[PDB]
């Protein structure tokens, strides 16, 4: 998208979201990142929404195909098509990880931006881990863990316990522990401690911030209800 103005790419990403054209939205935001300037808070959300929706559709398709393939293992076409979807998903995750490494993370100095990008890095390694097998699974799992852990360390030092990015990071790291790392007790402990420390800080918030924080706290509670 090298010939399109940065501001036009941002405008078109917002239009693509309204039109539910998430592949277009992600291509516009990739072009905006590749202009080389840092992203504002709103622009970071556009980037994350676009890729989360693209890879979320790929993950849902991979899960459908993987279930069919497992049932048939109780011609080569189901495996071949699952592999095609899997390769496409891996390619999108590699694209997002490449944007983060060249050069969003290294230029992000404020806590809000650095935590946001490291949470993304943990998420896209987690999506790679969902489809990985064997020893390659191990190194991919550790890369997700390391990204989430650095984000957690910064968030605990620099953000209040109700900050929505801090809360969403803790939510997704808890899902990592439960679904990827085979650590359900760590998942439950992290979700409970996060919820309780946020509850104790709600008194400091305005009505609008209260709504944002309580919405994510309810997601933590929904997981705790499913896990206990």
């Amino acid at each position: 998208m090298g010939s399109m103005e940065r501001a036009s790419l941002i405008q078109k990403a917002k239009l693509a979201e309204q039109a539910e054209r998430y592949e277009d939205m992600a291509a516009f935001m990739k072009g905006a990142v590749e202009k080389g300037e840092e992203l504002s808070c709103e622009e970071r959300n556009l980037l994350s929404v676009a890729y989360k929706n693209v890879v979320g559709g790929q993950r849902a398709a991979w899960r459908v195909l993987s279930s069919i393939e497992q049932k048939s293992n109780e011609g080569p076409e189901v495996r071949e098509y699952r592999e095609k979807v899997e390769t496409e998903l891996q390619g999108v995750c590699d694209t997002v990880l490449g944007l983060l490494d060249s050069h969003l993370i290294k230029e992000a100095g404020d806590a809000e931006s650095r935590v946001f990008y490291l949470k993304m890095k943990g998420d896209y390694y987690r999506y790679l881990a969902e489809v990985a097998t064997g020893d390659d699974k191990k190194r991919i799992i550790d890369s997700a863990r390391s990204a989430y852990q650095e984000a957690m360390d910064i968030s605990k030092k620099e953000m209040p316990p109700t900050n929505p990015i801090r809360l969403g990071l803790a939510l997704n790291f808890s899902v990592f522990h439960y679904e990827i790392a085979n650590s359900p007790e760590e998942a439950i402990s992290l979700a409970k401690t996060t919820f309780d420390e946020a509850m104790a800080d709600l008194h400091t918030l305005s009505e609008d911030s209260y709504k944002d924080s309580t919405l994510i706290m309810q997601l933590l509670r929904d997981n705790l209800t499913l896990w206990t």
Binding site: K52, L171, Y178
Partner: peptide
């Protein structure tokens, strides 16, 4: 188990 959605 659910992770965070993209938008509120």
């Amino acid at each position: 188990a659910g992770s965070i959605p993209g938008r509120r």
